[PDB]
Every structure is written in structure tokens, then in C-alpha cells.
Amino acid sequence: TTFTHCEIHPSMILGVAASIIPFPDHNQSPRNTYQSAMGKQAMGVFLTN
Amino acid sequence: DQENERNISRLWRAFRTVKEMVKDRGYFITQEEVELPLEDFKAKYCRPQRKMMSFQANPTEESISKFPDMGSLWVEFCDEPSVGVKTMKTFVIHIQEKNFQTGIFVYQNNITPSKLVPSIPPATIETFNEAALVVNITHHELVPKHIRLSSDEKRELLKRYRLKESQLPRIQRADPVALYLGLKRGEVVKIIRKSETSGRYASYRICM
Amino acid sequence: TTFRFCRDCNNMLYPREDKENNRLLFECRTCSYVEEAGSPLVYRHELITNIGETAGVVQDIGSDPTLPRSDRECPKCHSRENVFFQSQQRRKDTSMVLFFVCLSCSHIFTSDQKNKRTQ
Amino acid sequence: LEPGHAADQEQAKLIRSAIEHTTLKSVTIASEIYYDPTVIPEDEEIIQLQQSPWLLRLELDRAAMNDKDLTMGQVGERIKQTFKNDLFVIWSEDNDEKLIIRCRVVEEDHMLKKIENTMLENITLRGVENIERVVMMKYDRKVPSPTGEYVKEPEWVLETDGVNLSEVMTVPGIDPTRIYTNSFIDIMEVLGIE
Amino acid sequence: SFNQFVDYTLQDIICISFGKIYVT
Amino acid sequence: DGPTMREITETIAEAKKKVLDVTKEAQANLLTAKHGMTLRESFEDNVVRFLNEARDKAGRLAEVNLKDLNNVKQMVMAGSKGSFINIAQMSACVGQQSVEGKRIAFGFVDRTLPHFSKDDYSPESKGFVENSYLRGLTPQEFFFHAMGGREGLIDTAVKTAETGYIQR
Amino acid sequence: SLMSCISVGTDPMPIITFLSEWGMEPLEDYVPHQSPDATRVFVNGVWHGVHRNPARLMETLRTLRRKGDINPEVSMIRDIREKELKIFTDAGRVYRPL
Amino acid sequence: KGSRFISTLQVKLYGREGSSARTIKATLPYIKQDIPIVIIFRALGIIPDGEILEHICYDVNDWQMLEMLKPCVEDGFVIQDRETALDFIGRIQYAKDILQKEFLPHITQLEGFESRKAFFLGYMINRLLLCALDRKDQDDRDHFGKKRLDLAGPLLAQLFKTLFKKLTKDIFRYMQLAINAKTITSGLKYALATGNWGEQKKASRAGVSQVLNRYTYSS
RNA sequence: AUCGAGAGGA
DNA sequence: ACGTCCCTCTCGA
Ligand SMILES: [Zn+2]
Ligand SMILES: [Zn+2]
The missing domain is CATH 3.90.1110.10 (RNA polymerase Rpb2, domain 2)
Incomplete structure (x- = not known):
């Protein structure tokens, strides 16, 4: 117990996209690499205007 | 007594494989002559001195059939680890005045340029080293049986398979086995090896 | 070897021998200063390096919060409050024997049982 | 290994330390130079049984002479040999307190430091060079038992980390009709193109 | 990065004499 | 879970002991410098044989718990799609994640993550993801699994242009 | 990543003066042959001076930005094992909160 | 700086x-x-x-x-x-x-x-x-703390400085306000419009001004 | 249309 | 000295 600081929440190492993966702590890492750049080639409301 | 006996074996073993080559080339040696152990080798050759163990074998009666010009081969050794042109003139006149066909001279450590080897037509002489002769390469697991082809065995392969000289796989004059049989340019050879498929494939090679 | 320099030039000294009295002098080639040697040890190579196997461990050494603390006592004050670290001579072979350092009295002592290190 | 006693762990143990390539730098722990026409304290009993006052005191390591197990009487011997009678050399003994060799040249300040490095790297000891390490190991091999079938007698084989087959061929006690190296370029130079 | 560029470090590049600079 | 996971939780523990011995034994200079490799590499090469066979000989306890009416078992029993390593990584324990061949590196100050001790050779901080995909990795575990796969992607993508220049 | 941000660029002058007023010896009047435990200061790769006991220095500063007197993006560090202290008012550092 | x-x-x-x-x-x-x-x-x-x-x-x-x-x-x-x-x-x-x-x-x-x-x-x-x-x-050399990165500011800083560069050696030609004003604008325009980060018209770290991605708000 | 840069598909 | 095959978009002289 020589702790200097403490992490806010460990889920903040996630990137911009890969934050949307449901339970990445239960998948192979190269699968989390795909859904990362795969949610970028999707469809949906990109803006309201 | 020191540890000179380790240098003593590493020349008897050479001597045997040096003489082994002479039978495979096409000369007259018996298996008991080469299998002559070092115990009988020291008794009749000691005190190890090399100018006593110079030999002269000569062609067999089978070799004179397809190699009818393979003549007298004289082989002399040297005691001096380094050899100059002064002793070479003493050796070249052995073959020159008696007019033999080929000669092989074993130096045991080093020779200088003093260069004169290709100057007795018709007689090119091979030069080997006890460092590479102590163990024989041709006994190895993956060195196939190279067999020399005659001048008529040659032009017979070139007619049956409808070839020109170039169109045949090649071995080079400095190839460790082309030295071991003293191959010249134009001579062919019939590598017979085991095969994972045919069981006995027979490849051919010419020498440059 | 821990040799010195001239006192008039502060330039290094190249040894020389007294060819008559048989003694060693530390000559100078900037000026002509001379002095006779202290020890006959002129050169040392030392191939298996051991100087610095605990390098860098001065004042506030039980402070760096990175290094955790052990629960074992020291050979004088016997404090179970003390830090530790591996050999800081980062060579490819040096063993993982751990050089303990005490927070309370600041002195080095190994756990190596094959021998017993002093530094 | 050789045909007969190839199941002999010890026959290869010597061949292990017969081509593993030793040099002075391997065993030497500290090389010092001194000016001393017989000063150094604990050297007085050794000197018991014309040159140059320049000393060369190199000290070996205990455990260094076990892993390859060299002999003090021979490590200095080929130091004594590689310079003819031009270097006055005598060593310690193997049951001593600390192993040390001393040499004298027979100005020469840096010119003895000349043979400071010359001894370290270019004076090999016990083995053939370029084979910078070996390691024996057992691997199973099928061979016909005299009853007729193929059976399971293993053997040993020294696996090197370097290739100079040119003269590891000719070492005694091995099988020079079998020795194999990955260097197919070196195999071509020694054994033939085929 | 842009705010600290336009505010300060944009003015620093003024070295018939150049002074304080305004951007609309 | 059915009382098989209960005993897979001890092989993950007993295999810590088999590497907890060679832990402080190696910092007592007792570790026999094996024929050739150094003291350091003798510990790594001896600890990964205890972690690889820990990971391996932890999932093959589950390969028998699943009855012949399991589906993913019926998938590898035919060979349709599945391996045994697929089962241990999902059910039992994923295992040691390795970058460039060896265990993880010390890109920091002789340590692995700014959450662990300095000068530490632990398996729980050198890439042994003890949890399974079912259970859920922890942020440390998840990260190493990351660097173990970056190596893969880098490979199967920036080493697939030489395979194809060899062919040409 | 999400909570990551990037340094913007701070000025080094109003802290290299805060050093000279708390135990910094510039290196023109510095020779190590009377002070070997001399810790070395660094600001953006500049060795400006020397200090003796960094104990209450690196912690009077670590609580100087925590109250706002020094910019929070400027990073402290002292390598105790090597007796050095680097300070970065740099522009381009990738700082995370904690 | x-x-x-x-x-x-x-x-x-x-x-x-x-x-x-x-x-x-x-x-x-x-x-x-x-x-x-x-x-x-x-x-x-x-x-x-x-x-x-x-x-x-x-x-x-x-x-x-x-x-x-x-x-x-x-x-x-x-x-x-x-x-x-x-x-x-x-x-x-x-x-x-x-x-x-x-x-x-x-x-x-x-x-x-x-x-x-x-x-x-x-x-x-x-x-x-x-x-x-x-x-x-x-x-x-692959340590990340030793690495910095230039965002919009310092990138523009190199470009703005290297644009003002030969602007002041072009006003040195107004003697031998009616100075050049398009060159600062068309230079900032070019680099941010091509991706080849300026440097007159000779390219130089090409692919830095990428067009934005608008397929999903996440992307 | 042409060349030049950029993100992706297996 | 050359540095995988083919394919879909998008934009500046
Ligand atoms: Zn002087
Ligand atoms: Zn104490």
C-alpha cells in the first residue's frame, strides 16, 4: 500500500469508437479491433440537420 | 611422448582416405592396404616421416577397358609444412623424366605460388591438403556415388537423350568430389542416389 | 587505479620509471612536473564487472513509492520496514538476487545465501 | 557421436568441451599491469622456484574453470607457446587461493598493453573456433535390433551455435559420415553440389 | 490547440515594425 | 460451472505454487544455471513451461465435463469448426499472452504497468490472463491480451506481402 | 482514448525563477568536486541548476500546481535512483487524469 | 518557438x-x-x-x-x-x-x-x-512519453511561420501599402485543402488534412 | 475526362 | 536493388 494515485474507472482506456462494444472483457482482442473500425462503416443518424 | 600422437592419427587417417581415393579413381589397391591400422603404420613408417610413405599404384584391368589411356600415377609427399618452387622442380621431374600420366602431391600445411602445375602437357597434376583429406567426404550420409563416364559413354548419353553439351546439369571443377576423382572439363558423371519416389533416380552432370 | 594529475598544470600524468634507483614516477608532458607513484597499480581492466551492482542508492531511498517494502529485518536495527530492488547493473546475466535496503538505518544487505554480498 | 558407444553421455562430454571454443577472455576476471622489478604481497610464495620490470597480472575466475573445466597448467601453456621464448610466463596452481598468471616482456608502457588485448580475444584455449557454444541432448532414433524389427535405442548429439564444419569434420570420436549443419551453402562447399 | 494558437502563439510571429495584430 | 470449474480453480492456484517456488528460489542463487542459457533465461524458460501447461492442463478438465449432448463439443467432435484451444480459452483460462516470443516487456521503469511493483517478475503482471472469456478479464488482463494481438495483426498484414513476393 | 488530452504549451520563465528562490545553484558556479549528491534540474531538456535535498522541493511543487500556482498540464518528475529532476512545459504531451 | x-x-x-x-x-x-x-x-x-x-x-x-x-x-x-x-x-x-x-x-x-x-x-x-x-x-525509441504530437495549432504554426517567411522577403522588394496579401491566404488554403502540408508547391508529409467522416456520429 | 493525395472492401 | 494480388469510393492542377 504505497499507492500515490487511483484510477477513475478502468473503462477509459477504450478509444473513441471501441467504447461501444458490449463487454469487451469477454472477447478476443483482434475481434475488438474489427468492431472498432467496423462501427465506422455503418449506417444511422450521423447528424440531425 | 607429449601429445604428438594426436597429430600422428590425423595423418594415418588421412593416408587411408588418401589411398581410398586412388582405388575409386581407377587404380590397384586392396582393402587390407587401406585398412592398415596405425599400429602397423607406425611400425613400418617410424619418428613419423612422410617422404617414406610416397606410393605409386597403377590402373586395374577393369579400368583399362573404358579408360585405356589412364596411365601411370605417381604420388609423392613432403615433410616441410611449407613448400616452395625448389621442391616442386624436384617433384615435377619425377613425372617429367619418367613420363607418367598424372600425379597427386599432398602438402600438409601450406604452399606458395612458386604456379608451375599446368606446364607439363600432357599431364595436369592435382594438389590436395591433409586438412581436408583426414576425413573422406565421399562416405557422408548425403553424398551420392559419383561415377566417371568415358569418352564413348559421354557421346552415348548425348545421342540417346538428344542433347547438346550445354543442356546437361553441371558440376564444377572445384566441386569437392570433382577433385576427389580429378574431373576435367568435358568429362561427364552419373550421380546415382536414393529416391523418396523412384527408389533409385540416376542424375547426370558434366564438368567445366 | 585512482590516479591524479599535475599540481601546476592539472593535466594528467603519464608514468615513467627511475632507470637508476628502480622506482616509479608519474611524469607530466605539458610541463616538467614529476612525482613518484603511490601504488604500483598502473592499469586495471576488470572484465567481470561488479562496481555498481547496487549503484544509485543515496539519500531518500526508502522514498520512491515505486519500490514496495519487504517484511524482513536488517542485520543491525532489525526493521521489518525497508525497501528493496534488483541489481541495477542491468547486464544480461546478473542474477535476480535482491539487494534489500533499510528505511531506518540505510545500509545494504543481500538475501543471497550462496555467498553474502557486502555491497 | 561415434558408432559404438554413442549411448555414452561422457564420450560426448569431452567432445562438448573439445570444440566449444574457449579463449582467455572467457575465464579472465581482471587484467592488471604493474611496475615491479618482486613486490606484490601474496605472490611471494609463487616466485619461489634480463627480462623487463613491466608486470602483466591477469586473474581468472573460480567457477570459470569448471563449466568448461580448464586446467591452470594448460591455460598459461598456450600463452607461453603463442609468443615463443619471447615472453617469460609462469602461473599459479589449481589448488591455490587465487588463480593468477604473471608475464614480463623479455619504452614499453603501452607496448605491453599491446599484448593486453592480444591475449584476451586472439588466444583461444580449448576447442575449434566459430562454434561459439554447444549443448548435448538425447533424441530418440529407430534402428534394427538384431532380432529383426526396428526398435528404440536413443543416443546423444552436440548441437552448435556456429558453423566451421571444415575442421569439425575431422575431430575424433564423432561420426564424420553423418554430421549435419543447416548451412546448406557450407554443405555445398565441403561435400559437393549433389 | 487552435485557441492557444490564435490568442498567443499567433502574435509571437512578428519579428516598418510590426505590433499587436487583430483577427476578425 | 457444474463442479468442474470448482477444481479448475486449484490448478490455476497450484500452478502459482509451481512458479512461486522458482520465484524466491531464483533470487537466492539456487537456480541451477542450466547447460547454456543464463540464470535469467533459465527462469523464464522454466516458468513458461509451468504456465503453458497450466493453461493447457486447465481446460482439458472441462473437455470431459461437457456431455456428448453439448453443441460446441458436437462441433469439434465432427471437426465442423472448433479446436481444443478454443474451449480452454473460453471456459477455463485464456493463458499467457506473449509479445515478440517472450512474455511481456518492461517498457516502463523495469515494470509492466503503473499499477504494479517495480522490478517484478510475477505472472499476474507478466501476461497471464487467469480469467476466461466467460468470466471476464480485468483491465490489466485485457490490455496484455491487446498487445498479444497487435503482434498478430501486424504479422498477418505486414508479413503477407513477402509470402506473396516469394510466389511471384 | 476518451479521458486523454494533449499539452498546449506553457511558459518556462515564471518557474525557473521559482527555482532560483528555493535552492537552485546555476551551473556557472558549479564544480562537482565539492557536491556529488548534486541533483540536477531540467526544464524541457535544459539543465539550468542544481539542488541538494529534493525532498521538500518536488513536494512543495507537487502541491503548487495542485492549488493552481503552476499550470496543471506541466509534468513533474524526479528519478530518485539517478538523482535527476526533469520538468516539461512542453507542447505535445499526452496527459491522462487521475 | x-x-x-x-x-x-x-x-x-x-x-x-x-x-x-x-x-x-x-x-x-x-x-x-x-x-x-x-x-x-x-x-x-x-x-x-x-x-x-x-x-x-x-x-x-x-x-x-x-x-x-x-x-x-x-x-x-x-x-x-x-x-x-x-x-x-x-x-x-x-x-x-x-x-x-x-x-x-x-x-x-x-x-x-x-x-x-x-x-x-x-x-x-x-x-x-x-x-x-x-x-x-x-x-x-518506442517509448511513448518521449513522443510528442502536433495538433491543429503547432501544425498551423509551422505553416503560418513558413508562410510569413517569404512574405517579408516579398515586401523587401517593394522598394527597388500595396504589399502581397493573397499569398498568406492561398497558402493556408492550399495546405488545408490538399493534405500535402504546404511547403510552397513541392510535396512533404502528405495526408494531414483529411476530409471528415460522416457515416455515423460515432465515426 | 487525365494525373496527384486521401479513407476503406476480403 | 525491388519491395502481394484485384476491387470500391472520394478530391486538387
Ligand atoms: Zn603539469
Ligand atoms: Zn537497520
């Missing part, structure tokens, strides 16, 4: 292990060969070979560090004072300018700082040796 400066500094220890020719030299901006670490030390002002060794050694007991410092003293023992040092760098005083200016300028390029330029130089030869005696694992 005022340039780019592509002039880097090299200091290398010659002679590998076993070579007793381990001379330390240094390659400097605008200078051909590698200068021994002593000649540059005297062109600085630190003269006696022996007085320079406190700038290198921060504890005169590392006798194994000072042993590698032997020959580099003799390698540059032929020059003895400050004048002779900077002539070997070649009226020929021009070396004092290069030393004062394009050399360790992350300190100041004013003269009178000749002591921080030396005490930094010795600190570099210092850190060089700790790796030669394996008291330090060579630094991590």
Missing part, C-alpha cells in the same frame, strides 16, 4: 569491446569530420586535460569510467589551448560563431553561456558511458 532547426548533434564512442582505440568524437552542425570531445572542450574554454574531467565525471571514483577517458585525452592532446582548438575546426575564427550559434541552441545562442554548454556536453558523454558499462539499458 521560433524555427524548425534540422541540425542535430552526434556524439559517439568509437572502438567496440576489446578495442583499445575507444576514442570519443563528436559530429556537429556544419562541420565535416568528427571532432574529439577534448578539442571542442577547449574551443569552449575549458583548457587543461584533467579540468574537463569534472564536467564528465560527477564522482571522481568511477575509475572504470575515467579509464575510457584516457585516449580521447591523448587523441586531442596535440591541441592545447582554445585558439588551436577552433582552427582545426576549419580569420579562421568562424568556429566560435558556429559553436555560439548552431550548437546546443536549446540553452541560448548567446556567447557568455560557455559553462552550460560544457556542463551539458559532459553530461551527455556521461550518460553515453553508463550504457557502455551496462549500468543502463539503452533508451526506448
Whole structure:
């Protein structure tokens, strides 16, 4: 117990996209690499205007 | 007594494989002559001195059939680890005045340029080293049986398979086995090896 | 070897021998200063390096919060409050024997049982 | 290994330390130079049984002479040999307190430091060079038992980390009709193109 | 990065004499 | 879970002991410098044989718990799609994640993550993801699994242009 | 990543003066042959001076930005094992909160 | 904060292990060969070979560090004072300018700082040796704390500075307000519009002004 | 249309 | 000295 600081929440190492993966702590890492750049080639409301 | 006996074996073993080559080339040696152990080798050759163990074998009666010009081969050794042109003139006149066909001279450590080897037509002489002769390469697991082809065995392969000289796989004059049989340019050879498929494939090679 | 320099030039000294009295002098080639040697040890190579196997461990050494603390006592004050670290001579072979350092009295002592290190 | 006693762990143990390539730098722990026409304290009993006052005191390591197990009487011997009678050399003994060799040249300040490095790297000891390490190991091999079938007698084989087959061929006690190296370029130079 | 560029470090590049600079 | 996971939780523990011995034994200079490799590499090469066979000989306890009416078992029993390593990584324990061949590196100050001790050779901080995909990795575990796969992607993508220049 | 941000660029002058007023010896009047435990200061790769006991220095500063007197993006560090202290008012550092 | 400066500094220890020719030299901006670490030390002002060794050694007991410092003293023992040092760098005083200016300028390029330029130089030869005696694992070129990144600001800073560059040498032509105004605009426009980050019209880190992605708000 | 840069598909 | 095959978009002289 020589702790200097403490992490806010460990889920903040996630990137911009890969934050949307449901339970990445239960998948192979190269699968989390795909859904990362795969949610970028999707469809949906990109803006309201 | 020191540890000179380790240098003593590493020349008897050479001597045997040096003489082994002479039978495979096409000369007259018996298996008991080469299998002559070092115990009988020291008794009749000691005190190890090399100018006593110079030999002269000569062609067999089978070799004179397809190699009818393979003549007298004289082989002399040297005691001096380094050899100059002064002793070479003493050796070249052995073959020159008696007019033999080929000669092989074993130096045991080093020779200088003093260069004169290709100057007795018709007689090119091979030069080997006890460092590479102590163990024989041709006994190895993956060195196939190279067999020399005659001048008529040659032009017979070139007619049956409808070839020109170039169109045949090649071995080079400095190839460790082309030295071991003293191959010249134009001579062919019939590598017979085991095969994972045919069981006995027979490849051919010419020498440059 | 821990040799010195001239006192008039502060330039290094190249040894020389007294060819008559048989003694060693530390000559100078900037000026002509001379002095006779202290020890006959002129050169040392030392191939298996051991100087610095605990390098860098001065004042506030039980402070760096990175290094955790052990629960074992020291050979004088016997404090179970003390830090530790591996050999800081980062060579490819040096063993993982751990050089303990005490927070309370600041002195080095190994756990190596094959021998017993002093530094 | 050789045909007969190839199941002999010890026959290869010597061949292990017969081509593993030793040099002075391997065993030497500290090389010092001194000016001393017989000063150094604990050297007085050794000197018991014309040159140059320049000393060369190199000290070996205990455990260094076990892993390859060299002999003090021979490590200095080929130091004594590689310079003819031009270097006055005598060593310690193997049951001593600390192993040390001393040499004298027979100005020469840096010119003895000349043979400071010359001894370290270019004076090999016990083995053939370029084979910078070996390691024996057992691997199973099928061979016909005299009853007729193929059976399971293993053997040993020294696996090197370097290739100079040119003269590891000719070492005694091995099988020079079998020795194999990955260097197919070196195999071509020694054994033939085929 | 842009705010600290336009505010300060944009003015620093003024070295018939150049002074304080305004951007609309 | 059915009382098989209960005993897979001890092989993950007993295999810590088999590497907890060679832990402080190696910092007592007792570790026999094996024929050739150094003291350091003798510990790594001896600890990964205890972690690889820990990971391996932890999932093959589950390969028998699943009855012949399991589906993913019926998938590898035919060979349709599945391996045994697929089962241990999902059910039992994923295992040691390795970058460039060896265990993880010390890109920091002789340590692995700014959450662990300095000068530490632990398996729980050198890439042994003890949890399974079912259970859920922890942020440390998840990260190493990351660097173990970056190596893969880098490979199967920036080493697939030489395979194809060899062919040409 | 999400909570990551990037340094913007701070000025080094109003802290290299805060050093000279708390135990910094510039290196023109510095020779190590009377002070070997001399810790070395660094600001953006500049060795400006020397200090003796960094104990209450690196912690009077670590609580100087925590109250706002020094910019929070400027990073402290002292390598105790090597007796050095680097300070970065740099522009381009990738700082995370904690 | 005022340039780019592509002039880097090299200091290398010659002679590998076993070579007793381990001379330390240094390659400097605008200078051909590698200068021994002593000649540059005297062109600085630190003269006696022996007085320079406190700038290198921060504890005169590392006798194994000072042993590698032997020959580099003799390698540059032929020059003895400050004048002779900077002539070997070649009226020929021009070396004092290069030393004062394009050399360790992350300190100041004013003269009178000749002591921080030396005490930094010795600190570099210092850190060089700790790796030669394996008291330090060579630094991590793939370490991320050692890496910086330029965002919009500093990227524009290079472009704005390199645009204002030849604007002021184009107003120097208005004599031999009616100055050029399109060049600052069309330059900022070009680089941010092509991706080839400006540099007149010769490309240079191409692919930095990418068009945005609008398929999903997440993307 | 042409060349030049950019993100992706297996 | 050349540095996988083919394919879909998008934009500046
Ligand atoms: Zn002097
Ligand atoms: Zn104590």
C-alpha cells in the first residue's frame, strides 16, 4: 500500500469508437479491433440537420 | 611422448582416405592396404616421416577397358609444412623424366605460388591438403556415388537423350568430389542416389 | 587505479620509471612536473564487472513509492520496514538476487545465501 | 557421436568441451599491469622456484574453470607457446587461493598493453573456433535390433551455435559420415553440389 | 490547440515594425 | 460451472505454487544455471513451461465435463469448426499472452504497468490472463491480451506481402 | 482514448525563477568536486541548476500546481535512483487524469 | 518557438569491446569530420586535460569510467589551448560563431553561456558511458512519453511561420501599402485543402488534412 | 475526362 | 536493388 494515485474507472482506456462494444472483457482482442473500425462503416443518424 | 600422437592419427587417417581415393579413381589397391591400422603404420613408417610413405599404384584391368589411356600415377609427399618452387622442380621431374600420366602431391600445411602445375602437357597434376583429406567426404550420409563416364559413354548419353553439351546439369571443377576423382572439363558423371519416389533416380552432370 | 594529475598544470600524468634507483614516477608532458607513484597499480581492466551492482542508492531511498517494502529485518536495527530492488547493473546475466535496503538505518544487505554480498 | 558407444553421455562430454571454443577472455576476471622489478604481497610464495620490470597480472575466475573445466597448467601453456621464448610466463596452481598468471616482456608502457588485448580475444584455449557454444541432448532414433524389427535405442548429439564444419569434420570420436549443419551453402562447399 | 494558437502563439510571429495584430 | 470449474480453480492456484517456488528460489542463487542459457533465461524458460501447461492442463478438465449432448463439443467432435484451444480459452483460462516470443516487456521503469511493483517478475503482471472469456478479464488482463494481438495483426498484414513476393 | 488530452504549451520563465528562490545553484558556479549528491534540474531538456535535498522541493511543487500556482498540464518528475529532476512545459504531451 | 532547426548533434564512442582505440568524437552542425570531445572542450574554454574531467565525471571514483577517458585525452592532446582548438575546426575564427550559434541552441545562442554548454556536453558523454558499462539499458525509441504530437495549432504554426517567411522577403522588394496579401491566404488554403502540408508547391508529409467522416456520429 | 493525395472492401 | 494480388469510393492542377 504505497499507492500515490487511483484510477477513475478502468473503462477509459477504450478509444473513441471501441467504447461501444458490449463487454469487451469477454472477447478476443483482434475481434475488438474489427468492431472498432467496423462501427465506422455503418449506417444511422450521423447528424440531425 | 607429449601429445604428438594426436597429430600422428590425423595423418594415418588421412593416408587411408588418401589411398581410398586412388582405388575409386581407377587404380590397384586392396582393402587390407587401406585398412592398415596405425599400429602397423607406425611400425613400418617410424619418428613419423612422410617422404617414406610416397606410393605409386597403377590402373586395374577393369579400368583399362573404358579408360585405356589412364596411365601411370605417381604420388609423392613432403615433410616441410611449407613448400616452395625448389621442391616442386624436384617433384615435377619425377613425372617429367619418367613420363607418367598424372600425379597427386599432398602438402600438409601450406604452399606458395612458386604456379608451375599446368606446364607439363600432357599431364595436369592435382594438389590436395591433409586438412581436408583426414576425413573422406565421399562416405557422408548425403553424398551420392559419383561415377566417371568415358569418352564413348559421354557421346552415348548425348545421342540417346538428344542433347547438346550445354543442356546437361553441371558440376564444377572445384566441386569437392570433382577433385576427389580429378574431373576435367568435358568429362561427364552419373550421380546415382536414393529416391523418396523412384527408389533409385540416376542424375547426370558434366564438368567445366 | 585512482590516479591524479599535475599540481601546476592539472593535466594528467603519464608514468615513467627511475632507470637508476628502480622506482616509479608519474611524469607530466605539458610541463616538467614529476612525482613518484603511490601504488604500483598502473592499469586495471576488470572484465567481470561488479562496481555498481547496487549503484544509485543515496539519500531518500526508502522514498520512491515505486519500490514496495519487504517484511524482513536488517542485520543491525532489525526493521521489518525497508525497501528493496534488483541489481541495477542491468547486464544480461546478473542474477535476480535482491539487494534489500533499510528505511531506518540505510545500509545494504543481500538475501543471497550462496555467498553474502557486502555491497 | 561415434558408432559404438554413442549411448555414452561422457564420450560426448569431452567432445562438448573439445570444440566449444574457449579463449582467455572467457575465464579472465581482471587484467592488471604493474611496475615491479618482486613486490606484490601474496605472490611471494609463487616466485619461489634480463627480462623487463613491466608486470602483466591477469586473474581468472573460480567457477570459470569448471563449466568448461580448464586446467591452470594448460591455460598459461598456450600463452607461453603463442609468443615463443619471447615472453617469460609462469602461473599459479589449481589448488591455490587465487588463480593468477604473471608475464614480463623479455619504452614499453603501452607496448605491453599491446599484448593486453592480444591475449584476451586472439588466444583461444580449448576447442575449434566459430562454434561459439554447444549443448548435448538425447533424441530418440529407430534402428534394427538384431532380432529383426526396428526398435528404440536413443543416443546423444552436440548441437552448435556456429558453423566451421571444415575442421569439425575431422575431430575424433564423432561420426564424420553423418554430421549435419543447416548451412546448406557450407554443405555445398565441403561435400559437393549433389 | 487552435485557441492557444490564435490568442498567443499567433502574435509571437512578428519579428516598418510590426505590433499587436487583430483577427476578425 | 457444474463442479468442474470448482477444481479448475486449484490448478490455476497450484500452478502459482509451481512458479512461486522458482520465484524466491531464483533470487537466492539456487537456480541451477542450466547447460547454456543464463540464470535469467533459465527462469523464464522454466516458468513458461509451468504456465503453458497450466493453461493447457486447465481446460482439458472441462473437455470431459461437457456431455456428448453439448453443441460446441458436437462441433469439434465432427471437426465442423472448433479446436481444443478454443474451449480452454473460453471456459477455463485464456493463458499467457506473449509479445515478440517472450512474455511481456518492461517498457516502463523495469515494470509492466503503473499499477504494479517495480522490478517484478510475477505472472499476474507478466501476461497471464487467469480469467476466461466467460468470466471476464480485468483491465490489466485485457490490455496484455491487446498487445498479444497487435503482434498478430501486424504479422498477418505486414508479413503477407513477402509470402506473396516469394510466389511471384 | 476518451479521458486523454494533449499539452498546449506553457511558459518556462515564471518557474525557473521559482527555482532560483528555493535552492537552485546555476551551473556557472558549479564544480562537482565539492557536491556529488548534486541533483540536477531540467526544464524541457535544459539543465539550468542544481539542488541538494529534493525532498521538500518536488513536494512543495507537487502541491503548487495542485492549488493552481503552476499550470496543471506541466509534468513533474524526479528519478530518485539517478538523482535527476526533469520538468516539461512542453507542447505535445499526452496527459491522462487521475 | 521560433524555427524548425534540422541540425542535430552526434556524439559517439568509437572502438567496440576489446578495442583499445575507444576514442570519443563528436559530429556537429556544419562541420565535416568528427571532432574529439577534448578539442571542442577547449574551443569552449575549458583548457587543461584533467579540468574537463569534472564536467564528465560527477564522482571522481568511477575509475572504470575515467579509464575510457584516457585516449580521447591523448587523441586531442596535440591541441592545447582554445585558439588551436577552433582552427582545426576549419580569420579562421568562424568556429566560435558556429559553436555560439548552431550548437546546443536549446540553452541560448548567446556567447557568455560557455559553462552550460560544457556542463551539458559532459553530461551527455556521461550518460553515453553508463550504457557502455551496462549500468543502463539503452533508451526506448518506442517509448511513448518521449513522443510528442502536433495538433491543429503547432501544425498551423509551422505553416503560418513558413508562410510569413517569404512574405517579408516579398515586401523587401517593394522598394527597388500595396504589399502581397493573397499569398498568406492561398497558402493556408492550399495546405488545408490538399493534405500535402504546404511547403510552397513541392510535396512533404502528405495526408494531414483529411476530409471528415460522416457515416455515423460515432465515426 | 487525365494525373496527384486521401479513407476503406476480403 | 525491388519491395502481394484485384476491387470500391472520394478530391486538387
Ligand atoms: Zn603539469
Ligand atoms: Zn537497520
